[PDB]
Ligand binder design. Structure first.
Ligand SMILES: [Cl-]
Ligand SMILES: [Cl-]
Ligand SMILES: [Cl-]
Ligand SMILES: [Cl-]
Ligand SMILES: [Mg+2]
Ligand SMILES: [Mg+2]
Ligand SMILES: [Mg+2]
Ligand SMILES: [Mg+2]
Ligand SMILES: [Mg+2]
Ligand SMILES: [Mg+2]
Lengths: 250, 250, 250, 250
């Protein structure tokens, strides 16, 4: 089991990429708490992966600072000290910078930027200096590297996550905290939400978007996260891991 | 005059880098409005560069959304349609991610991230489709490329500016708006604020920080901004311009 | 076994990083041919990992174009069609650009650049369109991202490998070849050759070099290569994977 | 005159980008030697810009190491000590990595990589420690950042130039040589050679290639080179300057 003894929080773990991360984490021996906004979805998601000795759902919005405190306490009460934080919760807005309302701007940043900050800050505090082989995996995207004219606020958030994570990685390394911090950068990934938008997958699969001519699947992101959570990656910190079908290579 | 006919807003234009940008912009034939928080400083700054036929001060906090509207109106009433926006206002917090309070986080992002968003969004709206050769110059820094363990929130802000700017550049290019958007990335620059912090310049001048073994001066940033504001750079958009003494090259 | 059915060529596989890659590849079910310059070293290396049903040594200099042809034939005769090429062979020269002789320049590029080209070109030709889940892993380094004043020719070679690999990745993706191409970028890795240079590890472990305050081990590079060789990484192509203790994050 | 007192060598200065660099350098007060392969073209090019008190042609192939020595001597005899080297000579091959012959590979690298090495190495040696405000401008391209499946060897060369230049920049900075080294990265630029290839400009102008929906002109590259040659850029070293119509921003 590649994640023997690990205890992970996966935010936005009830759908899509986060769900697959949780699934493979459990497969590799981790205990996992998944978060999401909705109880129906979250309880189904947890039980689809395993019983409560290995996976539990907690309703939590990543923008909710006070709830973060409680989430660590709930997770540690269930499974012992947290070792691994996957800051995956996120939302999207389909607006150019020009067309973004300030309400849209603040709402997207409250999840995609504040939530990652809250989980990273608290993860460092609660995991440092415990010999846990701790790992914080911050979910950026291809939009942390390149612009998309239709994703202005999203681009801001993903670029912020990219560089903030390097700061945290460095501080943890220099202080010998036994905490690593890295970013994962998915390209386009097939999910029910993509399937719900007519034409989206075909748009994303054009060669001028994804050179492989198709989009990825959630397990593509799960497997790089297993590597990063595991002690196999004990010398990797402050780095970006891109799984994008070639999107950013052209 | 390399900026003949240009009309620029330079936020945080009363001190340091912004002041030098304003100075060289006026030298190259632009009309300039500089903003800053404090009237004493701002009125002295404007008159040190020129008379009110070429430069004026407006008291404005870049985090103040409603004031942005008014700032464009004031500038256009003085000098005619704005052509050039330099989003330079910024603040700093000397805290690791771990140690950043949420108040510090939100306050820094309100200037360094929201202010750049507000000026970029409004600049696109008010400059597009006017044949102005319009240019938005967003001030990132070396901390938009690399982490600094002591500058967590600052890193978040500068990474956000870096990538958000690419989104805006692309939208403007694809829609033929005649608006370019680029980022400038200073390394360490000698200013009175650096001089006020005992030991700072020597720290910044170590070869492991700045390979040139000294730090820069405000005109180093002014001259790259003249290039970017001018029609000389009409094919440059979505790009990062690094003036850092080699900091990021190692 | 994470590399079930894979058949790998690991150049420079008799020492250091390459040896560890070969070791973990065999552990994960691959068949492996390792190359190196010297028979004594190579035969000991192969037998330290396994018997000839899983690993064999072939004496080969990666700069030797004609030998590449033969190497694929030898490997396929032993183990069946090659699926995985790790272009790891390399040499180093400790000279600034200013001080590099043309002989040094050409010799280093013949291994570090031509060898990677030869293995990549031939790997595409011999692995495309066979449903192998083929993967070409080109060993760049931190010196593919940042300069080192003492490693001028080495920097040239590693930057060339970095970007050439993206070209190959794209061509393979666009043509549906079922071949991925990625680069791995080690930071400093403890080996007998580092141990032989008095003071080297301490130099490399300074916080201004490696923020973790120590250097890595060969298995750190082996494990990212297992991920990249395996079908777990089927959506990763054209990307750079950095395992450097934080070197490039500051 | 922004280049008062400068003495520049511009390789491949008889056509296209190099010709425009030479033209604007002379306009800004520099003395210039342009090189090229062909006397007819070179003598016409020089006289189109000015008389022999400001510009001269020397027939030289950048791959010719012995000729480099002589080129500096010729230039210094004409105009005094060289201050500025623009390594612009280059060739292209339209082949994937898979399809590149070794002859094509070596020939392209002899100009695009060896020529830049020869000019950089010799420029450092002959310009260091003379108080000249010396500047080496190495012409990379967008193909130093991103792959193109049809430009495998070209990608290798441009990535090598990109990173080798950082090594040189650092060495010069650390040793206080008064020599800066930077790379320029053109996107697509309209020239007679592009005009000669039916359909090329339209291909390059598609929004999925160049977001501005058109390609650039040689003066777009000349003006960034004026900035980099001038003392305005005295704090810029080891950096990449991208003028690409947005190509790399998406
Ligand atoms: Cl979903
Ligand atoms: Cl100041
Ligand atoms: Cl060794
Ligand atoms: Cl031409
Ligand atoms: Mg319908
Ligand atoms: Mg004191
Ligand atoms: Mg001794
Ligand atoms: Mg660095
Ligand atoms: Mg025809
Ligand atoms: Mg791209």
């Amino acid at each position: 089991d590649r994640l023997k003894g690990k205890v992970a929080i996966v935010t936005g773990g009830t759908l899509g990429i986060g769900l697959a991360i949780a699934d493979k984490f459990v497969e590799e021996g981790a205990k996992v708490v998944i978060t999401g906004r909705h109880a129906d979805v979250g309880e189904k998601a947890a039980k689809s992966i395993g019983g409560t000795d290995v996976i539990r759902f907690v309703q939590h919005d990543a923008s909710d600072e006070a709830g973060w405190t409680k989430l660590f306490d709930t997770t540690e009460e269930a499974f012992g000290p947290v070792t691994t934080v996957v800051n995956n919760a996120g939302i999207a807005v389909s607006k150019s910078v020009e067309d973004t309302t300030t309400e849209e701007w603040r709402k997207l940043l409250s999840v995609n930027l504040d939530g990652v900050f809250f989980g990273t800050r608290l993860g460092i505090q609660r995991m440092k200096n415990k010999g846990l082989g701790a790992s914080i995996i911050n979910m950026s995207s291809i939009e942390g590297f390149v612009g998309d004219p239709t994703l202005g606020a999203y681009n801001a958030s993903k670029g912020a996550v990219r560089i903030m994570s390097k700061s945290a990685a460095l501080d943890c390394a220099l202080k010998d905290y036994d905490v690593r911090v890295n970013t994962v950068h998915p390209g386009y990934i097939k999910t029910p939400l993509v399937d719900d938008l007519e034409g989206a997958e075909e748009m994303m699969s054009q060669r001028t978007k994804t050179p492989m001519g198709h989009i990825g699947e959630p397990n593509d992101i799960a497997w790089i996260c297993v590597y990063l959570a595991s002690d196999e990656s004990k010398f990797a910190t402050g780095a970006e891991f891109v799984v994008d079908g070639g999107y950013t290579a052209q």
